From Swiss-Prot, chain C:
Belongs to the RNA polymerase beta chain family. The RNAP catalytic core consists of 2 alpha, 1 beta, 1 beta' and 1 omega subunit. When a sigma factor is associated with the core the holoenzyme is formed, which can initiate transcription. The chain holds residues 1085 to 1136 of 1342 of the full protein. DNA-dependent RNA polymerase catalyzes the transcription of DNA into RNA using the four ribonucleoside triphosphates as substrates. Coiled coil: none annotated. This is DNA-directed RNA polymerase subunit beta.
From Swiss-Prot, chain E:
Belongs to the RNA polymerase beta chain family. DNA-dependent RNA polymerase catalyzes the transcription of DNA into RNA using the four ribonucleoside triphosphates as substrates. This is DNA-directed RNA polymerase subunit beta. The RNAP catalytic core consists of 2 alpha, 1 beta, 1 beta' and 1 omega subunit. When a sigma factor is associated with the core the holoenzyme is formed, which can initiate transcription. The gene is rpoB. It comes from the Bacteria. The modification N6-acetyllysine is found at K12. The chain holds residues 1189 to 1239 of 1342 of the full protein.
Swiss-Prot record, chain G:
The lineage of its organism: Bacteria, Pseudomonadati, Pseudomonadota, Gammaproteobacteria, Enterobacterales. GO terms for cellular component: DNA-directed RNA polymerase complex. One of its GO terms (molecular function) is DNA binding. This is DNA-directed RNA polymerase subunit omega. InterPro entries: DNA-dir_RNA_pol_omega (IPR003716), Pol_omega/Rpo6/RPB6 (IPR006110), RPB6/omega-like_sf (IPR036161). Pfam families: RNA_pol_Rpb6 (PF01192). The RNAP catalytic core consists of 2 alpha, 1 beta, 1 beta' and 1 omega subunit. When a sigma factor is associated with the core the holoenzyme is formed, which can initiate transcription. Belongs to the RNA polymerase subunit omega family. Its EC number is 2.7.7.6. Promotes RNA polymerase assembly. Latches the N- and C-terminal regions of the beta' subunit thereby facilitating its interaction with the beta and alpha subunits. Coiled coil: none annotated. NCBIfam families: rpoZ. It catalyses: RNA(n) + a ribonucleoside 5'-triphosphate = RNA(n+1) + diphosphate. Keywords: DNA-directed RNA polymerase, Nucleotidyltransferase, Transcription, Transferase.
Length: 228, 51, 52, 33, 51, 50, 83, 230
RNA sequence: UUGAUUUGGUGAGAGG
């Protein structure tokens, strides 16, 4: 009663934020077990930090409009949600950015502390039409795990925040997409086996194999109790 | 006898060698089409659904 | 296999798209009435296994 | 398949041969009678 | 034959849902199929056209 | 036949579902919201597509 | 690898002459003496022929030039070996 | 990382076969993941002993009939394929069933050894009708997993066995039905935790905490390929 | 130099 251990045969690194972990061969009906377990953990349980709240002057709710910008505040909320930040020591850091002049505002323009850094400084935030326009936002960064959206965030909150605070979806987990297939491999007698092909694309702040190893050790330490 | 070494020989003669699948009342030319084989544990031709 | 919440897998999966075109709707009433027949059979199997 | 059921071969037919009714290709089974 | 109301009434004698349809989960993903599906017992035959 | 039913059930809409009228920063997190169990496959939504 | 031959059809624009040019080339590789002009990924001589066609280095003119070059090499070999 | 770890807190036996088991506490969202993974492993890959070769005296092939019995020999082989055995020490044992006299032949009539335990003393096999009839079969019980059938085991068997041993298909898996439920946990300070209520249905031969421990070890040793190498 | 017979033809039934 002995099981087939696989060898990790391939990391086809397409880009720095892309991978394809070809993996073979497993027992019949085990590729779906490993793939689905890793996929659910990587979607809704992997820890990490991103932007949750932001306080901007000139706005009172999510459907107002500040001057000097081509885009609107839904677009600044969405481009803020796309920003990937990492916090090392603490877990509740407030950041503030101020920009004036003819030109777009990028992620490198922000004021940063010693504990935080930006993994993509050329990630755009907004663009500025007026040289007299002075944008200002107070960007708070918490740290949780997985995904929590602004809809159930505003359903769960009850304390009256000051007017000008904006909620955003908290993309805590650093992966953007994981989707696998199960193909069919062959050990020389039994054709019933199956080969895993895990695809993964993340943001910055991590290397896809590091995310896979993190999810695997999360599940192993979760199941570490009742083993032999 | 079908020993253990002829299946690797078979996967090395299949690889880039198309076959003509043909349904028995062929009416127009799309009823003979050439595929590449993928070997099947079984006794039935697995045929891609769109085709 | 697709298991219901009781835990039993289903044995054979057919395809619903055959049913609007091939207008043989009797297989669905056979399906529901056979489901009811085995519902009575499972009920008797409980009443006789957990013996009364 | 390829087994022998009834040895049924003649001499003068080296020059001897194998007409011995065998089992057809692809089938298995148990001789029931 | 049996009318439909008697099928529903017999499905109420057994403890089964009246619509004939049970919610089914998926064995691969463990998560529910939306829009409940039909499960029942059909008398299926094996015809002598063997592969 | 099966695949057009899968598409016609996928790309459709209903007047209320999970995640009605929320806003999404791309199609990747649209599939991530469908898989995690926070929205429905047909729920009208502003996305940002390129 | 190979799924479609569409670029090879683009560079030899007849779609019926593609088979003949790639067959002449794949007979130059199969029996054949010759070695391919392209790296082989354990593809067969069919796919290596069509894969040479797609990158634009085998057509009918190149094969006739190479066979004239081999005919001249055999001519010079016969003349320099005998005389 | 504010995670926790689960334990098997309460293991209730509803009967000797059908038996539930809790798991507590699980983190948020982990319930369906562990439940579906333990379902797939616990249905595919459990070790259980089953009948493999049946040797009746005076019977050549399985499609004959015998003196003094009801069920025919294919019926006897099916009723023996349903048998539920639980060996402890060895991995391959040979039992013996000898019985004469009018009446049914239960599974409780097998002359057991010390390390084999037949857990179904009302499993019927034969219905002996003649009082001058006898039946002396010698069963062989291996131990494996999955489903290995007679066709593949027609040439796979290396140990050259003699002719006259009927080959029965091997249904090795002793788990037949398993369902898990993700309830709401009763944690005195947390509300975002859940419990996993796995409801097994065994062959009677497997111990449920042992089955869960083995499935957990299978899952951990499969994931070690992800953990260690990349 | 190391081995062998249906196609032929009729009738009936079946599959797509």
């Amino acid at each position: 009663t002995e099981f087939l251990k696989p060898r990790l045969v391939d990391i086809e690194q397409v880009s720095s934020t892309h991978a394809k972990v070809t993996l073979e061969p497993l027992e019949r009906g085990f590729g779906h077990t490993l793939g689905n377990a890793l996929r659910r953990i990587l979607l809704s349980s992997m820890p990490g930090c991103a932007v949750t709240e932001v306080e901007i002057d000139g706005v009172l709710h999510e459907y107002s409009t500040k001057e000097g910008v081509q885009e609107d505040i839904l677009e600044i909320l969405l481009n803020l949600k796309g920003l990937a930040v990492r916090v090392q020591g603490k877990d509740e850091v407030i950041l503030t950015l101020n920009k004036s002049g003819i030109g777009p505002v990028t992620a490198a323009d922000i004021t940063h502390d010693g504990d935080v850094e930006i993994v993509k400084p050329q990630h755009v935030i907004c663009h500025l039409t007026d040289e007299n326009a002075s944008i200002s936002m107070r960007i708070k960064v918490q740290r949780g795990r997985g995904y929590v959206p602004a809809s159930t965030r505003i359903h769960s909150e009850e304390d009256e925040r000051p007017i000008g605070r904006l909620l955003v979806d908290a993309c805590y987990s650093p992966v953007e997409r994981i989707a696998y297939n199960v193909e069919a491999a062959r050990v020389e007698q039994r054709t019933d086996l199956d080969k895993l092909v895990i695809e993964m694309e993340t943001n910055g702040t991590i290397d896809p194999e590091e995310a896979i190893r993190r999810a695997a050790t999360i599940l192993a330490e979760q199941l570490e109790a009742f083993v032999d | 006898r079908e020993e253990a070494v002829v299946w690797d020989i078979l996967d090395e003669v299949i690889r880039e060698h198309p076959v003509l699948l043909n349904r028995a009342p062929t009416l127009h030319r799309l009823g003979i089409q050439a595929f590449e084989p993928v070997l099947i544990e079984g006794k039935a031709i697995q045929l891609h659904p769109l085709v | 296999m697709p298991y219901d919440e009781n835990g039993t897998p289903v044995d054979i999966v057919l395809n619903p798209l055959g049913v609007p075109s091939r207008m043989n709707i009797g297989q669905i009433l056979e399906t529901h009435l056979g489901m009811a027949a085995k519902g009575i059979g499972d009920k008797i199997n409980a009443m006789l296994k957990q013996q009364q | 398949g390829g087994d022998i059921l009834v040895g049924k071969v003649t001499p003068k037919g080296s020059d001897v041969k194998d007409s011995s009714l065998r089992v057809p290709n692809g089938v298995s089974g148990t001789v029931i009678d | 034959g049996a009318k439909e109301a008697e099928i529903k009434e017999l499905l109420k004698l057994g403890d089964l849902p009246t619509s004939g349809q049970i919610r089914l989960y998926d064995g691969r993903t463990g998560e529910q199929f939306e829009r409940p599906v039909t499960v029942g017992y059909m008398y299926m035959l094996k015809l002598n056209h063997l592969v | 036949q099966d695949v057009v039913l899968g598409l016609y059930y996928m790309t459709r809409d209903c007047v209320n579902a999970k995640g009605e009228g929320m806003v999404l920063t791309g199609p990747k997190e649209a599939e991530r919201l469908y898989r995690s169990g926070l929205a429905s496959l047909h729920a009208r939504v502003k996305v940002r597509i390129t | 690898a190979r799924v479609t031959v569409q670029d090879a059809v683009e560079k030899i624009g007849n779609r019926f002459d593609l088979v003949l040019v790639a067959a002449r080339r794949a007979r130059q590789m199969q029996v054949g003496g010759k070695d391919p002009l392209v790296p082989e990924e354990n593809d067969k001589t069919t796919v290596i022929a069509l894969r040479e066609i797609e990158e634009g280095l085998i057509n009918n003119q190149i094969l006739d030039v190479r066979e004239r070059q081999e005919q001249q090499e055999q001519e010079a070999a016969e003349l320099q070996a005998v005389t």
